[PDB]
Structure 1
Amino acid sequence: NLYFQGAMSIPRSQTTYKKKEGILTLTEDRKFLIWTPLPATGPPTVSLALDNITNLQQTPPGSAKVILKFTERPRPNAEPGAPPPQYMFQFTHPTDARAEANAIRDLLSQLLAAA
């Protein structure tokens, strides 16, 4: 019977990464999570293929900061004791930070399950 894909639009959210302000979004094919520093006219500094993402975590509501943390699959010759690569994005929209985190989280979780 029927097959449905997510139809919510791709958001562009104000976020800090490694203490630099930028924009977190997805590529138009919804296959990469990309973060670009402001002004966001250059190339992404982070490009994470959703196929390589193994975990999605968040600060709980009421935390000092609204953060999503994405974990990637270990690099090929990483040592077996080493932590996996991780990426923390702090949402900085003065009123909508948590809403915006929620929207990205929901869209990513849907895409990750659909693959």
Structure 2
Amino acid sequence: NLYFQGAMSIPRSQTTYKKKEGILTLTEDRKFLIWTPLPATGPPTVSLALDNITNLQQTPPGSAKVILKFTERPRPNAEPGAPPPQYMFQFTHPTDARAEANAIRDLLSQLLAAA
């Protein structure tokens, strides 16, 4: 009858969003995926509630870029043919890009299924 929560630390990963460099992480409550542009002392420019995330995709290993793509629920007044909102983050750590992507992906998938 035991219940366990995830206990891996929250990563802060070097990532590019809409061609600007920044940091992808989660809020301390693990409810929001947040991206903040460098220097990273301002507020996030992307804040995605894990409750609104509907898919998580990745470039396959050996691709030119390491990218995670998060899809969000359609916005309330979107037209029915419109694509859903999406957010692509390219991992730019020179050696650890794919490792960091995997770590975020794993943490996110665990949280998404836990909720």
Asked whether the two chains share a fold, i.e. TM above 0.5, the reply is yes
Distance between the aligned counterparts of 2:71 and 2:2, measured in 1?
A: 32
**What is the CA distance between 1:42 and its match in structure 2?**
0.1
Q: Deviations over 1:73-104 (max 9, x none)?
A: 00000000000000000000000000000000
Partner residue of 1:77? 77
Partner residue of 2:108? 108
Partner residue of 1:60? 60
**What is the CA distance between 1:46 and its match in structure 2?**
0.0
- Taking only aligned residues, the RMSD between alpha carbons, in angstroms, comes to 0.1
Segments of structure 1 that go 5 or more residues without pairing to the other structure are: none
Q: Deviations over 1:37-73 (max 9, x none)?
A: 0000000000000000000000000000000000000
Distance between the aligned counterparts of 1:5 and 1:93, measured in 2?
A: 28
Distance between the aligned counterparts of 1:107 and 1:5, measured in 2?
A: 11
Q: Deviations over 1:9-61 (max 9, x none)?
A: 00000000000000000000000000000000000000000000000000000
Identity of matched residues, %: 100
Aligned residues: 115
